[PDB]
Protein backbone atom coordinates (compact mmCIF):
# COMPACT_ATOMS: atom_id res chain seq x y z
CA UNK A 1 0.00 0.00 0.00
CA UNK A 2 1.69 3.17 -1.22
CA UNK A 3 -1.12 5.47 -2.37
CA UNK A 4 -4.86 5.55 -1.73
CA UNK A 5 -7.90 7.59 -2.76
CA UNK A 6 -10.35 8.74 -0.09
CA UNK A 7 -13.70 7.06 -0.77
CA UNK A 8 -15.29 9.55 1.61
CA UNK A 9 -14.53 12.83 3.34
CA UNK A 10 -13.23 12.52 6.86
CA UNK A 11 -13.10 15.17 9.59
CA UNK A 12 -10.51 14.97 12.40
CA UNK A 13 -12.31 13.40 15.35
CA UNK A 14 -9.29 12.37 17.37
CA UNK A 15 -6.16 14.28 18.28
CA UNK A 16 -3.70 13.10 15.63
CA UNK A 17 -6.15 12.39 12.82
CA UNK A 18 -5.66 13.58 9.27
CA UNK A 19 -8.77 15.07 7.67
CA UNK A 20 -9.42 14.65 3.94
CA UNK A 21 -12.09 15.09 1.29
CA UNK A 22 -13.48 12.37 -0.97
CA UNK A 23 -11.33 11.70 -4.02
CA UNK A 24 -8.25 13.22 -2.35
CA UNK A 25 -5.01 11.31 -2.91
CA UNK A 26 -3.14 10.07 0.14
CA UNK A 27 0.17 8.30 0.67
CA UNK A 28 0.44 5.55 3.28
CA UNK A 29 3.40 5.88 5.64
CA UNK A 30 2.58 3.17 8.20
CA UNK A 31 -0.26 0.69 8.67
CA UNK A 32 -1.58 0.32 12.22
CA UNK A 33 -4.46 -2.08 11.68
CA UNK A 34 -7.52 0.21 11.47
CA UNK A 35 -5.72 3.55 11.72
CA UNK A 36 -3.10 4.11 9.06
CA UNK A 37 -0.55 6.94 9.15
CA UNK A 38 -1.06 8.97 5.99
CA UNK A 39 0.40 11.86 4.00
CA UNK A 40 -1.85 14.07 1.88
CA UNK A 41 -0.32 14.62 -1.55
CA UNK A 42 -2.36 17.82 -1.60
CA UNK A 43 -1.75 19.48 1.77
CA UNK A 44 1.25 17.39 2.81
CA UNK A 45 0.21 17.07 6.45
CA UNK A 46 0.93 13.74 8.17
CA UNK A 47 -1.87 12.10 10.15
CA UNK A 48 -3.90 9.04 11.09
CA UNK A 49 -6.70 7.84 8.89
CA UNK A 50 -9.31 5.11 9.05
CA UNK A 51 -8.51 2.41 6.47
CA UNK A 52 -12.19 1.71 5.73
CA UNK A 53 -12.28 5.21 4.24
CA UNK A 54 -9.72 4.57 1.50
CA UNK A 55 -8.86 2.21 -1.33
CA UNK A 56 -5.53 1.27 -2.94
CA UNK A 57 -4.77 3.83 -5.67
CA UNK A 58 -1.65 2.22 -7.13
CA UNK A 59 -1.72 0.53 -10.60
CA UNK A 60 -2.83 -3.08 -10.97
CA UNK A 61 -0.10 -3.99 -13.42
CA UNK A 62 2.43 -4.55 -10.65
CA UNK A 63 0.04 -6.77 -8.64
CA UNK A 64 1.38 -10.33 -8.29
CA UNK A 65 -1.96 -11.78 -9.28
CA UNK A 66 -2.98 -9.49 -12.08
CA UNK A 67 -2.57 -10.55 -15.69
CA UNK A 68 -4.43 -8.11 -17.88
CA UNK A 69 -3.54 -9.37 -21.37
CA UNK A 70 -4.38 -12.98 -20.64
CA UNK A 71 -7.12 -15.07 -22.23
CA UNK A 72 -9.24 -17.60 -20.40
CA UNK A 73 -7.34 -20.59 -21.91
CA UNK A 74 -3.98 -18.92 -21.27
CA UNK A 75 -5.07 -18.47 -17.67
CA UNK A 76 -6.64 -21.89 -17.40
CA UNK A 77 -3.41 -23.56 -18.50
CA UNK A 78 -0.87 -21.45 -16.65
CA UNK A 79 -2.69 -22.37 -13.42
CA UNK A 80 -2.39 -26.07 -14.18
CA UNK A 81 1.31 -25.63 -14.94
CA UNK A 82 3.80 -26.84 -12.29
CA UNK A 83 4.71 -24.38 -9.56
CA UNK A 84 1.02 -23.91 -8.74
CA UNK A 85 -1.49 -25.80 -6.66
CA UNK A 86 -5.00 -25.78 -5.25
CA UNK A 87 -5.76 -22.24 -4.21
CA UNK A 88 -3.64 -20.67 -6.95
CA UNK A 89 -5.51 -17.81 -8.60
CA UNK A 90 -5.25 -14.81 -10.88
CA UNK A 91 -7.34 -12.00 -12.30
CA UNK A 92 -7.53 -11.02 -15.92
CA UNK A 93 -9.58 -8.56 -17.94
CA UNK A 94 -12.09 -10.48 -20.10
CA UNK A 95 -11.14 -9.90 -23.77
CA UNK A 96 -14.77 -10.68 -24.67
CA UNK A 97 -16.67 -8.53 -22.13
CA UNK A 98 -14.07 -5.71 -21.95
CA UNK A 99 -14.09 -3.45 -18.89
CA UNK A 100 -15.08 -6.52 -16.92
CA UNK A 101 -12.67 -8.65 -14.92
CA UNK A 102 -12.52 -12.36 -14.23
CA UNK A 103 -11.02 -14.49 -11.46
CA UNK A 104 -9.46 -17.88 -12.09
CA UNK A 105 -8.58 -20.22 -9.28
CA UNK A 106 -7.28 -23.79 -9.25
CA UNK A 107 -9.02 -26.38 -7.10
CA UNK A 108 -9.11 -30.19 -6.85
CA UNK A 109 -12.20 -32.18 -7.78
CA UNK A 110 -12.32 -35.57 -6.05
CA UNK A 111 -13.95 -36.68 -9.31
CA UNK A 112 -11.99 -34.86 -12.05
CA UNK A 113 -8.87 -34.03 -10.03
CA UNK A 114 -7.18 -30.77 -10.98
CA UNK A 115 -9.56 -28.15 -12.39
CA UNK A 116 -9.74 -24.37 -12.80
CA UNK A 117 -12.94 -22.60 -11.80
CA UNK A 118 -13.73 -19.17 -13.26
CA UNK A 119 -15.72 -16.39 -11.61
CA UNK A 120 -16.89 -13.14 -13.10
CA UNK A 121 -16.21 -9.92 -11.33
CA UNK A 122 -19.22 -7.72 -11.89
CA UNK A 123 -18.85 -3.97 -12.01
CA UNK A 124 -20.64 -1.72 -9.56
CA UNK A 125 -22.18 1.70 -10.38
CA UNK A 126 -19.98 3.87 -8.12
CA UNK A 127 -17.08 2.08 -9.77
CA UNK A 128 -16.71 -0.78 -7.31
CA UNK A 129 -16.58 -4.56 -7.81
CA UNK A 130 -17.97 -7.83 -6.54
CA UNK A 131 -18.29 -11.53 -7.19
CA UNK A 132 -21.15 -12.02 -4.80
CA UNK A 133 -23.64 -9.22 -4.18
CA UNK A 134 -23.21 -10.18 -0.53
CA UNK A 135 -19.82 -8.39 -0.35
CA UNK A 136 -18.71 -5.43 -2.49
CA UNK A 137 -15.33 -3.78 -2.87
CA UNK A 138 -14.14 -0.34 -4.03
CA UNK A 139 -11.31 -1.95 -5.98
CA UNK A 140 -9.85 -5.29 -7.07
CA UNK A 141 -7.23 -5.08 -4.32
CA UNK A 142 -9.85 -5.08 -1.58
CA UNK A 143 -11.60 -8.00 -3.23
CA UNK A 144 -8.46 -10.17 -3.42
CA UNK A 145 -7.45 -9.16 0.11
CA UNK A 146 -10.90 -10.31 1.11
CA UNK A 147 -10.99 -13.68 -0.64
CA UNK A 148 -7.50 -14.70 0.36
CA UNK A 149 -8.58 -14.51 4.01
CA UNK A 150 -12.03 -16.14 3.61
CA UNK A 151 -13.60 -18.08 0.77
CA UNK A 152 -17.16 -17.07 1.60
CA UNK A 153 -18.84 -18.33 -1.51
CA UNK A 154 -15.71 -19.36 -3.39
CA UNK A 155 -14.81 -23.03 -3.65
CA UNK A 156 -11.51 -22.16 -1.93
CA UNK A 157 -9.68 -19.13 -0.57
CA UNK A 158 -7.34 -17.39 -3.01
CA UNK A 159 -4.25 -19.04 -1.53
CA UNK A 160 -1.44 -18.07 -3.88
CA UNK A 161 -0.97 -16.02 -7.06
CA UNK A 162 -0.23 -17.95 -10.23
CA UNK A 163 3.47 -18.57 -11.01
CA UNK A 164 5.39 -18.93 -14.30
CA UNK B 1 -45.51 -1.07 3.01
CA UNK B 2 -41.80 -1.88 3.13
CA UNK B 3 -40.16 0.47 0.69
CA UNK B 4 -36.51 0.32 -0.36
CA UNK B 5 -34.26 2.27 -2.70
CA UNK B 6 -31.72 0.54 -4.92
CA UNK B 7 -28.24 1.66 -3.82
CA UNK B 8 -26.69 0.07 -6.88
CA UNK B 9 -27.86 -1.44 -10.12
CA UNK B 10 -28.32 -5.19 -10.12
CA UNK B 11 -28.16 -7.60 -13.02
CA UNK B 12 -29.99 -10.89 -12.30
CA UNK B 13 -27.37 -13.53 -11.52
CA UNK B 14 -29.56 -16.56 -10.67
CA UNK B 15 -32.93 -17.77 -11.89
CA UNK B 16 -35.67 -16.09 -9.90
CA UNK B 17 -33.68 -12.87 -9.58
CA UNK B 18 -35.21 -9.43 -10.04
CA UNK B 19 -33.11 -6.88 -11.94
CA UNK B 20 -33.14 -3.19 -11.08
CA UNK B 21 -31.39 0.16 -11.47
CA UNK B 22 -29.73 2.42 -8.93
CA UNK B 23 -32.25 4.85 -7.43
CA UNK B 24 -35.14 2.60 -8.32
CA UNK B 25 -37.84 2.07 -5.71
CA UNK B 26 -39.03 -1.41 -4.71
CA UNK B 27 -41.33 -2.93 -2.11
CA UNK B 28 -40.23 -5.82 0.05
CA UNK B 29 -42.51 -8.84 0.09
CA UNK B 30 -40.33 -11.41 1.91
CA UNK B 31 -37.19 -11.25 4.07
CA UNK B 32 -35.01 -14.33 3.52
CA UNK B 33 -31.71 -13.54 5.13
CA UNK B 34 -29.45 -12.27 2.36
CA UNK B 35 -32.00 -12.48 -0.41
CA UNK B 36 -35.31 -10.67 -0.29
CA UNK B 37 -38.51 -11.09 -2.28
CA UNK B 38 -39.21 -7.78 -3.97
CA UNK B 39 -41.61 -6.12 -6.38
CA UNK B 40 -40.56 -3.34 -8.67
CA UNK B 41 -42.84 -0.31 -8.29
CA UNK B 42 -42.03 0.46 -11.88
CA UNK B 43 -43.04 -2.76 -13.64
CA UNK B 44 -44.77 -4.71 -10.90
CA UNK B 45 -42.33 -7.52 -11.61
CA UNK B 46 -41.26 -9.73 -8.69
CA UNK B 47 -38.08 -11.61 -7.81
CA UNK B 48 -35.24 -11.96 -5.32
CA UNK B 49 -32.79 -9.15 -4.58
CA UNK B 50 -29.53 -9.04 -2.61
CA UNK B 51 -30.43 -7.38 0.66
CA UNK B 52 -27.27 -5.27 0.81
CA UNK B 53 -28.07 -3.64 -2.50
CA UNK B 54 -30.90 -1.62 -1.01
CA UNK B 55 -31.74 0.68 1.90
CA UNK B 56 -34.99 1.31 3.78
CA UNK B 57 -36.92 4.07 2.03
CA UNK B 58 -39.53 4.43 4.79
CA UNK B 59 -39.61 7.79 6.58
CA UNK B 60 -37.81 8.03 9.94
CA UNK B 61 -40.56 9.87 11.77
CA UNK B 62 -42.74 6.75 12.30
CA UNK B 63 -39.78 4.90 13.80
CA UNK B 64 -40.15 3.90 17.49
CA UNK B 65 -36.66 5.22 18.15
CA UNK B 66 -36.72 8.48 16.28
CA UNK B 67 -37.54 11.73 18.06
CA UNK B 68 -37.09 14.67 15.67
CA UNK B 69 -37.62 17.50 18.12
CA UNK B 70 -35.79 16.26 21.20
CA UNK B 71 -32.94 18.05 23.00
CA UNK B 72 -29.79 16.47 24.43
CA UNK B 73 -31.03 17.16 27.97
CA UNK B 74 -34.51 15.88 27.20
CA UNK B 75 -33.07 12.60 25.99
CA UNK B 76 -31.22 12.19 29.26
CA UNK B 77 -34.41 13.17 31.08
CA UNK B 78 -36.53 10.50 29.34
CA UNK B 79 -33.84 7.85 28.97
CA UNK B 80 -33.13 8.00 32.71
CA UNK B 81 -36.81 8.08 33.68
CA UNK B 82 -38.32 4.82 34.93
CA UNK B 83 -39.76 2.43 32.37
CA UNK B 84 -36.39 2.26 30.63
CA UNK B 85 -33.24 0.35 31.50
CA UNK B 86 -29.71 -0.21 30.28
CA UNK B 87 -30.04 -0.65 26.54
CA UNK B 88 -32.69 1.98 25.97
CA UNK B 89 -31.87 4.38 23.15
CA UNK B 90 -33.18 6.99 20.76
CA UNK B 91 -32.12 8.97 17.73
CA UNK B 92 -32.55 12.73 17.62
CA UNK B 93 -31.43 15.66 15.47
CA UNK B 94 -27.99 16.90 16.47
CA UNK B 95 -27.93 20.06 18.59
CA UNK B 96 -24.30 20.99 18.00
CA UNK B 97 -24.73 20.39 14.27
CA UNK B 98 -27.60 20.67 11.79
CA UNK B 99 -28.46 18.13 9.11
CA UNK B 100 -26.99 15.61 11.56
CA UNK B 101 -28.37 13.28 14.21
CA UNK B 102 -27.23 12.04 17.58
CA UNK B 103 -27.52 8.64 19.21
CA UNK B 104 -28.52 8.59 22.86
CA UNK B 105 -28.55 5.41 24.87
CA UNK B 106 -28.83 4.47 28.53
CA UNK B 107 -25.98 2.34 29.88
CA UNK B 108 -24.82 1.03 33.24
CA UNK B 109 -21.57 1.50 35.09
CA UNK B 110 -19.94 0.16 38.26
CA UNK B 111 -19.09 3.70 39.39
CA UNK B 112 -22.27 5.66 38.65
CA UNK B 113 -25.46 3.72 37.92
CA UNK B 114 -27.52 4.16 34.79
CA UNK B 115 -25.89 6.80 32.55
CA UNK B 116 -26.55 8.39 29.18
CA UNK B 117 -23.95 8.27 26.44
CA UNK B 118 -24.33 10.47 23.38
CA UNK B 119 -22.84 9.51 20.05
CA UNK B 120 -22.70 11.89 17.13
CA UNK B 121 -23.93 10.31 13.94
CA UNK B 122 -21.54 11.83 11.44
CA UNK B 123 -22.80 12.35 7.89
CA UNK B 124 -21.21 10.96 4.75
CA UNK B 125 -20.65 12.49 1.31
CA UNK B 126 -23.00 10.16 -0.55
CA UNK B 127 -25.50 10.92 2.22
CA UNK B 128 -24.49 7.89 4.29
CA UNK B 129 -24.11 7.79 8.09
CA UNK B 130 -21.75 6.32 10.62
CA UNK B 131 -20.75 6.59 14.25
CA UNK B 132 -17.41 4.91 13.77
CA UNK B 133 -15.42 4.97 10.58
CA UNK B 134 -15.13 1.19 11.05
CA UNK B 135 -18.67 0.76 9.80
CA UNK B 136 -20.67 2.98 7.49
CA UNK B 137 -24.35 2.88 6.66
CA UNK B 138 -26.58 4.01 3.79
CA UNK B 139 -29.27 5.11 6.23
CA UNK B 140 -30.09 5.55 9.90
CA UNK B 141 -32.36 2.50 9.68
CA UNK B 142 -29.46 0.19 8.80
CA UNK B 143 -27.29 1.78 11.49
CA UNK B 144 -29.87 1.03 14.15
CA UNK B 145 -30.29 -2.54 12.87
CA UNK B 146 -26.54 -3.10 13.11
CA UNK B 147 -26.11 -1.87 16.65
CA UNK B 148 -29.23 -3.62 17.89
CA UNK B 149 -27.58 -6.97 17.16
CA UNK B 150 -23.99 -5.96 17.91
CA UNK B 151 -22.34 -3.23 19.94
CA UNK B 152 -18.92 -3.14 18.27
CA UNK B 153 -17.80 0.26 19.45
CA UNK B 154 -20.48 0.96 22.01
CA UNK B 155 -20.68 0.09 25.69
CA UNK B 156 -24.07 -1.55 25.10
CA UNK B 157 -26.42 -2.77 22.35
CA UNK B 158 -29.42 -0.71 21.25
CA UNK B 159 -31.77 -2.96 23.26
CA UNK B 160 -35.00 -0.97 23.02
CA UNK B 161 -36.49 2.35 21.91
CA UNK B 162 -37.05 4.89 24.67
CA UNK B 163 -40.45 4.79 26.33
CA UNK B 164 -42.71 7.60 27.53
CA UNK C 1 -47.06 -11.33 15.16
CA UNK C 2 -48.30 -14.16 17.38
CA UNK C 3 -45.96 -15.94 19.79
CA UNK C 4 -46.45 -18.52 22.51
CA UNK C 5 -44.50 -18.28 25.77
CA UNK C 6 -42.12 -21.23 25.90
CA UNK C 7 -41.37 -20.39 29.52
CA UNK C 8 -42.70 -18.10 32.23
CA UNK C 9 -40.94 -14.81 32.75
CA UNK C 10 -40.94 -12.52 35.76
CA UNK C 11 -40.21 -8.89 34.85
CA UNK C 12 -36.61 -8.02 35.60
CA UNK C 13 -35.95 -4.60 34.08
CA UNK C 14 -38.13 -1.56 33.64
CA UNK C 15 -40.58 -1.72 30.78
CA UNK C 16 -40.39 -5.53 30.79
CA UNK C 17 -43.56 -7.54 30.31
CA UNK C 18 -44.11 -10.59 32.50
CA UNK C 19 -45.99 -13.63 31.22
CA UNK C 20 -47.05 -17.15 32.20
CA UNK C 21 -45.60 -20.19 30.40
CA UNK C 22 -47.84 -21.09 27.48
CA UNK C 23 -49.33 -17.60 27.14
CA UNK C 24 -50.40 -16.03 23.83
CA UNK C 25 -48.66 -12.74 23.04
CA UNK C 26 -48.83 -10.23 20.19
CA UNK C 27 -45.54 -8.83 18.95
CA UNK C 28 -45.45 -5.10 18.30
CA UNK C 29 -41.71 -4.54 17.67
CA UNK C 30 -38.74 -6.83 16.91
CA UNK C 31 -35.85 -4.79 18.28
CA UNK C 32 -33.43 -7.67 17.94
CA UNK C 33 -32.98 -9.28 21.33
CA UNK C 34 -35.92 -7.62 23.11
CA UNK C 35 -39.34 -7.54 21.55
CA UNK C 36 -42.23 -5.21 22.28
CA UNK C 37 -45.16 -7.43 23.11
CA UNK C 38 -48.74 -7.35 24.34
CA UNK C 39 -50.57 -10.06 26.24
CA UNK C 40 -53.84 -11.45 24.82
CA UNK C 41 -55.17 -11.88 28.32
CA UNK C 42 -54.08 -8.71 30.07
CA UNK C 43 -53.69 -6.30 27.19
CA UNK C 44 -50.65 -5.04 29.08
CA UNK C 45 -47.62 -4.02 27.00
CA UNK C 46 -43.87 -4.38 27.42
CA UNK C 47 -40.63 -5.99 26.24
CA UNK C 48 -39.88 -9.69 26.31
CA UNK C 49 -36.79 -11.82 25.56
CA UNK C 50 -37.24 -13.23 22.04
CA UNK C 51 -35.97 -16.69 23.03
CA UNK C 52 -38.70 -17.21 25.64
CA UNK C 53 -41.28 -17.45 22.86
CA UNK C 54 -41.85 -18.98 19.44
CA UNK C 55 -43.85 -17.97 16.35
CA UNK C 56 -47.41 -19.20 16.89
CA UNK C 57 -48.59 -18.03 13.47
CA UNK C 58 -50.11 -20.82 11.33
CA UNK C 59 -47.82 -22.43 8.76
CA UNK C 60 -50.12 -22.41 5.73
CA UNK C 61 -49.12 -18.80 5.03
CA UNK C 62 -45.36 -19.45 5.16
CA UNK C 63 -43.69 -19.00 1.72
CA UNK C 64 -41.51 -22.05 2.25
CA UNK C 65 -44.22 -24.35 3.56
CA UNK C 66 -46.09 -26.69 1.23
CA UNK C 67 -48.30 -29.18 3.02
CA UNK C 68 -49.95 -31.23 0.26
CA UNK C 69 -46.76 -31.94 -1.68
CA UNK C 70 -45.21 -35.23 -2.76
CA UNK C 71 -41.46 -35.85 -2.52
CA UNK C 72 -41.00 -36.19 -6.27
CA UNK C 73 -43.20 -33.13 -6.65
CA UNK C 74 -40.85 -31.05 -4.54
CA UNK C 75 -37.92 -32.08 -6.74
CA UNK C 76 -39.73 -30.88 -9.81
CA UNK C 77 -40.98 -27.67 -8.29
CA UNK C 78 -37.45 -27.02 -6.98
CA UNK C 79 -35.63 -27.96 -10.18
CA UNK C 80 -38.01 -25.98 -12.43
CA UNK C 81 -37.22 -22.47 -13.78
CA UNK C 82 -37.34 -19.68 -11.23
CA UNK C 83 -35.32 -21.50 -8.58
CA UNK C 84 -31.58 -22.05 -7.94
CA UNK C 85 -28.93 -23.14 -5.42
CA UNK C 86 -30.32 -22.88 -1.93
CA UNK C 87 -33.98 -23.02 -2.94
CA UNK C 88 -35.93 -24.99 -0.36
CA UNK C 89 -39.35 -25.94 0.93
CA UNK C 90 -40.88 -27.88 3.74
CA UNK C 91 -43.48 -30.49 3.00
CA UNK C 92 -45.38 -32.95 5.16
CA UNK C 93 -43.19 -36.07 5.22
CA UNK C 94 -44.42 -38.58 2.66
CA UNK C 95 -43.49 -41.64 4.68
CA UNK C 96 -44.56 -40.62 8.17
CA UNK C 97 -48.01 -39.10 8.52
CA UNK C 98 -47.08 -36.35 10.96
CA UNK C 99 -43.46 -35.38 10.34
CA UNK C 100 -41.91 -32.87 7.99
CA UNK C 101 -39.15 -32.90 5.49
CA UNK C 102 -36.81 -30.15 4.34
CA UNK C 103 -36.11 -30.20 0.61
CA UNK C 104 -33.24 -28.14 -0.76
CA UNK C 105 -31.79 -27.68 -4.24
CA UNK C 106 -28.03 -27.56 -4.64
CA UNK C 107 -25.30 -28.32 -7.17
CA UNK C 108 -22.91 -31.20 -7.91
CA UNK C 109 -20.16 -32.34 -10.29
CA UNK C 110 -21.18 -35.96 -10.96
CA UNK C 111 -24.45 -34.41 -12.14
CA UNK C 112 -25.83 -30.88 -12.45
CA UNK C 113 -28.38 -29.45 -10.04
CA UNK C 114 -29.79 -31.80 -7.41
CA UNK C 115 -32.41 -31.89 -4.68
CA UNK C 116 -31.38 -32.98 -1.21
CA UNK C 117 -33.88 -34.17 1.39
CA UNK C 118 -33.64 -33.90 5.11
CA UNK C 119 -35.78 -35.65 7.67
CA UNK C 120 -36.96 -33.24 10.37
CA UNK C 121 -37.04 -35.29 13.58
CA UNK C 122 -39.32 -34.38 16.49
CA UNK C 123 -38.86 -33.65 20.16
CA UNK C 124 -40.84 -34.98 23.09
CA UNK C 125 -41.77 -31.43 24.06
CA UNK C 126 -42.86 -30.65 20.50
CA UNK C 127 -39.67 -29.17 19.06
CA UNK C 128 -37.76 -29.92 15.86
CA UNK C 129 -34.20 -30.60 14.71
CA UNK C 130 -32.27 -31.85 11.72
CA UNK C 131 -28.96 -32.02 13.47
CA UNK C 132 -28.93 -33.02 17.10
CA UNK C 133 -26.47 -30.12 17.24
CA UNK C 134 -29.30 -27.53 17.36
CA UNK C 135 -32.96 -27.94 18.26
CA UNK C 136 -35.94 -25.55 17.75
CA UNK C 137 -39.31 -24.76 19.38
CA UNK C 138 -40.91 -24.62 15.91
CA UNK C 139 -40.35 -24.75 12.13
CA UNK C 140 -40.08 -20.97 11.92
CA UNK C 141 -37.06 -20.89 14.16
CA UNK C 142 -35.66 -23.80 12.21
CA UNK C 143 -35.98 -22.05 8.81
CA UNK C 144 -34.80 -18.79 10.36
CA UNK C 145 -31.63 -20.44 11.57
CA UNK C 146 -30.70 -22.39 8.44
CA UNK C 147 -31.14 -19.37 6.22
CA UNK C 148 -28.47 -17.54 8.22
CA UNK C 149 -26.08 -20.53 8.37
CA UNK C 150 -25.32 -23.93 6.82
CA UNK C 151 -24.82 -25.36 10.29
CA UNK C 152 -24.35 -28.93 9.10
CA UNK C 153 -26.45 -28.75 5.94
CA UNK C 154 -25.02 -28.99 2.43
CA UNK C 155 -26.07 -25.44 1.56
CA UNK C 156 -27.50 -22.39 3.28
CA UNK C 157 -31.28 -22.04 2.76
CA UNK C 158 -31.17 -19.23 0.23
CA UNK C 159 -34.79 -18.82 -0.80
CA UNK C 160 -38.28 -20.42 -0.65
CA UNK C 161 -39.34 -22.52 -3.68
CA UNK C 162 -40.93 -20.49 -6.46
CA UNK C 163 -44.11 -21.71 -8.10
Amino acid sequence: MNLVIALHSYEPSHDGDLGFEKGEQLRILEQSGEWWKAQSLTTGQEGFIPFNFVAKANSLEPEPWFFKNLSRKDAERQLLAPGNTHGSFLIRESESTAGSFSLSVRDFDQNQGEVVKHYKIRNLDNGGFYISPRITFPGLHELVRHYTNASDGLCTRLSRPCQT
Amino acid sequence: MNLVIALHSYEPSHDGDLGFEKGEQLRILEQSGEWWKAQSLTTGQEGFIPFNFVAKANSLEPEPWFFKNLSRKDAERQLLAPGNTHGSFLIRESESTAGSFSLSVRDFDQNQGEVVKHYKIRNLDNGGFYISPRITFPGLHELVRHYTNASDGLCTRLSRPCQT
Amino acid sequence: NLVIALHSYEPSHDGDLGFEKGEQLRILEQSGEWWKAQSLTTGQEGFIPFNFVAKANSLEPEPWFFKNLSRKDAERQLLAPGNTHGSFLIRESESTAGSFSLSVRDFDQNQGEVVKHYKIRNLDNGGFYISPRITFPGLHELVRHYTNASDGLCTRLSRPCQT
Binding site: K117, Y119 | S13, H14 | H85, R156
Partner: peptide, 5 residues
Protein backbone atom coordinates in the same frame (compact mmCIF):
# COMPACT_ATOMS: atom_id res chain seq x y z
CA UNK D 1 -18.36 -19.85 -14.93
CA UNK D 2 -19.14 -20.95 -11.39
CA UNK D 3 -21.03 -19.07 -8.67
CA UNK D 4 -21.05 -18.11 -4.99
CA UNK D 5 -22.35 -20.37 -2.20
Amino acid sequence: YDYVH
